[PDB]
């Protein structure tokens, strides 16, 4: 065992398997204790087998699992797939010209508290029926949860909103609106009550600026202190879906939970014991990726997890996907030529607070 801390940075999980792994996973003493699978083809069957490695407070629809769990996946599915993705993309691209543009002249940003987040939140507020008005309101209280409005208030402060997002649509319900349709929707033969209502709407403010947002300030940070990779993607466009997926891939950072249900989980774990599934290891594993910590558009096989598999596998995948890709289009239409402030020093990977520079 290893006294091993799960909120350490990707590196830090690698360098840790790497010393440690044996037999597809490592063993952390710290806290309760707990299993870190290490192998991308060990975390996908994890992924895949929810009665081995269980997912089950009720946050809809991430904890839950069996057949109410696909119900509410296919109920959702209509407002989250590539098509909708599509749709939505003049505006999703409007939005990026409209900011990148609003900045262009200065030779500096800071990339996502300036750009990315009030993009990608105005994004999601499209996409999940949330008035445009409200941006400011809730970028406030986006920001107050990653610096812990402050730690105290933020969450309450979703809740009232998503409480008055409810009422607003049962007063005056809109066709086609996610939260509308929501009032005609049944789980399990039952109606669909506020409270799910509310923990799905939490779920999905939660869920869909963060992980977004890191990933366009991660590969963009990439891009601008490696000018071979910027001019690949500046002046051949149509690596860049490919490119987008490498960076998904080598940006990978979440580590869910599940806990083990038997004896010889994973070949490793016991029952009641916590596992965590980092894709920092799965993607990186070099009998899947060979050199994984190497960028390479032009990389052949790619079946990367950065989005998980299994029946939780992100409901936001296309969507993210666009908003990535429309987001870096976007960029090097504008601003093609760009850096890091000093670009010959290695920039840390981003996570939690940090401030992207980039200047031109
Ligand atoms: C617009 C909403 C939205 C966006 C954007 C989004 N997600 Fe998701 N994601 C979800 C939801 C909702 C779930 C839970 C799905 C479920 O439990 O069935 C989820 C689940 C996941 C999971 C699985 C967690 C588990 O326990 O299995 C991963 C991994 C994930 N998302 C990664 C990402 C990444 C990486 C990005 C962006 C680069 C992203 N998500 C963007 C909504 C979103």
Do not use: K
Not at 183 to 210: H, M
Request: proline share 6%.
């Amino acid at each position: 065992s290893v006294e091993f801390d799960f909120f350490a940075a990707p590196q830090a999980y690698r360098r840790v398997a790497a010393e440690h792994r044996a037999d597809g996973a490592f063993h952390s003493s710290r806290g309760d204790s707990f299993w870190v699978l290490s192998t991308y083809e060990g975390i996908c069957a994890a992924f895949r087998d929810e009665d081995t490695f269980s997912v089950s407070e009720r946050w809809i629809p991430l904890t839950i699992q069996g057949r109410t769990h696909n119900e509410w996946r296919r109920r959702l599915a209509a407002w989250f797939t590539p098509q909708r993705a599509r749709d939505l993309t003049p505006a999703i691209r409007a939005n990026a010209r409209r900011r990148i543009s609003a900045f262009v002249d200065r030779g500096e940003v800071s990339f996502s508290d300036e750009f990315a987040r009030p993009y990608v939140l105005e994004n999601l507020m499209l996409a999940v029926g949330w008035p445009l008005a409200d941006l400011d309101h809730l970028l406030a209280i986006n920001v107050a949860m990653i610096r812990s409005f402050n730690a105290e208030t933020a969450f309450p402060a979703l809740q009232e909103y998503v409480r008055r997002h409810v009422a607003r649509r049962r007063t005056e319900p809109v066709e086609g609106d996610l939260t509308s349709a929501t009032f005609d929707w049944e789980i399990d033969g039952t109606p669909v009550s506020d409270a799910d209502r509310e923990s799905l709407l939490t779920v999905l403010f939660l869920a869909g600026v963060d992980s977004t947002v890191n990933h366009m300030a991660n590969g963009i940070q990439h891009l601008a202190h490696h000018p071979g990779d910027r001019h690949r993607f500046l002046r051949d466009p149509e690596v860049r879906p490919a490119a987008v997926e490498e960076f998904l891939r080598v940006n990978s950072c979440m580590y869910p939970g599940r806990l083990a249900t038997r004896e010889g989980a994973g070949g490793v774990a016991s029952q009641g014991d916590t596992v965590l599934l980092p894709l920092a290891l799965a993607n990186y594993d070099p009998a899947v990726f060979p050199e994984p910590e190497r960028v390479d558009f032009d990389r052949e096989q790619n079946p990367h997890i950065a989005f998980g598999t299994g029946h939780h596998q992100c409901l936001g995948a296309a969507y993210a996907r666009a908003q990535i890709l429309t987001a870096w289009e976007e960029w090097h239409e504008l601003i093609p030529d760009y850096r890091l402030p000093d670009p010959t020093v290695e920039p840390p990977f981003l996570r939690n607070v940090y401030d992207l520079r980039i200047v031109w």
